[PDB]
Amino acid sequence: EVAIKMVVVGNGAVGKSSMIQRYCKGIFTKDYKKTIGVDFLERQIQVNDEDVRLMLWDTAGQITKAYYRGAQACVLVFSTTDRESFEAVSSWREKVVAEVGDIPTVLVQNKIDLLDDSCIKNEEAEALAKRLKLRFYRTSVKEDLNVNEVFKYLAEKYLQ
Ligand SMILES: Nc1nc2c(ncn2[C@@H]2O[C@H](COP(=O)(O)OP(=O)(O)NP(=O)(O)O)[C@@H](O)[C@H]2O)c(=O)[nH]1
Ligand SMILES: [Mg+2]
């Protein structure tokens, strides 16, 4: 079994904990509880012909070097309804790079079910993905849309 440590970063309330808990535990709740300390969740999946255990590290976005240390893949998350979270993506990217260098990374626009309150045009999100040279997924944790694919992509990229 191959273990992969993955970090998930982004501004407060973008849905980092919701993403991780949906992926690992299959649930979603509407109430916002800011993450306390660092929470460790895991999921065992199959990639090709190999058992893989994804070790997902969760912490609040509003961070110690120990959180990033040894990270092998990274999700950069912003929220459909939070322009500041989108503007902060580059800052989060550079924070991760400064800690661990070049690791497989993916850009995620979460809360896509709230498109009526969107603060980011589709073309702006895609322009950011291109400028950062990152694969881009639109997710809804509430609807369980594309969450599995985000983590599968990172696991496949690490193993390749
Ligand atoms: N409509 C909708 N709400 C979502 C979605 N994902 C998360 N939320 C909501 O957004 C709020 C914040 O989610 P949470 O996962 O705690 O965010 P976080 O990035 O972990 N925050 P923190 O950095 O403070 O720990 C919660 O009210 C949660 O229900 C989504 O895809 N759609
Ligand atoms: Mg959280």
Author numbering: 7 to 68, 74 to 171
Task: Quote the study's own text.
To elucidate the conformational changes of hRab23 when switching between the ON and OFF state, we determined, by X-ray crystallography, a structure of hRab237-172 (residues 7–172) in complex with GDP, representing the OFF state, and two structures of hRab237-172 in complex with GMPPNP, representing the ON state. The hRab237-172-GMPPNP structures were derived from crystals of different conditions and space groups. In the presence of GMPPNP, the main chain NH of Gly67 in the switch II loop interacts with an O of the γ-phosphate of GMPPNP through a hydrogen bond. This interaction leads to the switch II loop being pulled closer to the GMPPNP ligand, potentially leading to a change in the conformation of switch II, including the loss of a turn in the α2-helix within switch II. Nevertheless, the loops of switch II in both the GMPPNP-bound hRab237-172 structures are still partially disordered (residues 69–73 for the one in space group P31 2 1 and residues 68–73 for the one in space group P2 21 21). The switch I loop adopts a closed conformation in the structure of hRab237-172-GMPPNP (ON state). In both the GMPPNP-bound Rab23 structures, the triphosphate of GMPPNP is fully enclosed by residues from the switch I and P (β1-α1) loops. Residues Tyr38 and Thr41 from switch I differed significantly in terms of their positions in the ON state relative to the OFF state. In the ON state, the side chain hydroxyl of Tyr38 from switch I formed a hydrogen bond with the γ-phosphate of GMPPNP while the side chain of Thr41 chelated Mg2+ trans to the β-phosphate.
Rab23 is a member of the Rab family of small GTPases. It plays crucial roles in Hedgehog signaling, ciliary transport, and embryonic development. As a member of the Rab GTPase family, Rab23 acts as a molecular switch by cycling between the GDP-bound inactivated (OFF) state and the GTP-bound activated (ON) state. The structures of the hRab23 in complex with GDP or GMPPNP revealed a typical small GTPase fold of the Ras and Rab family proteins, containing six β-strands and five α-helices.
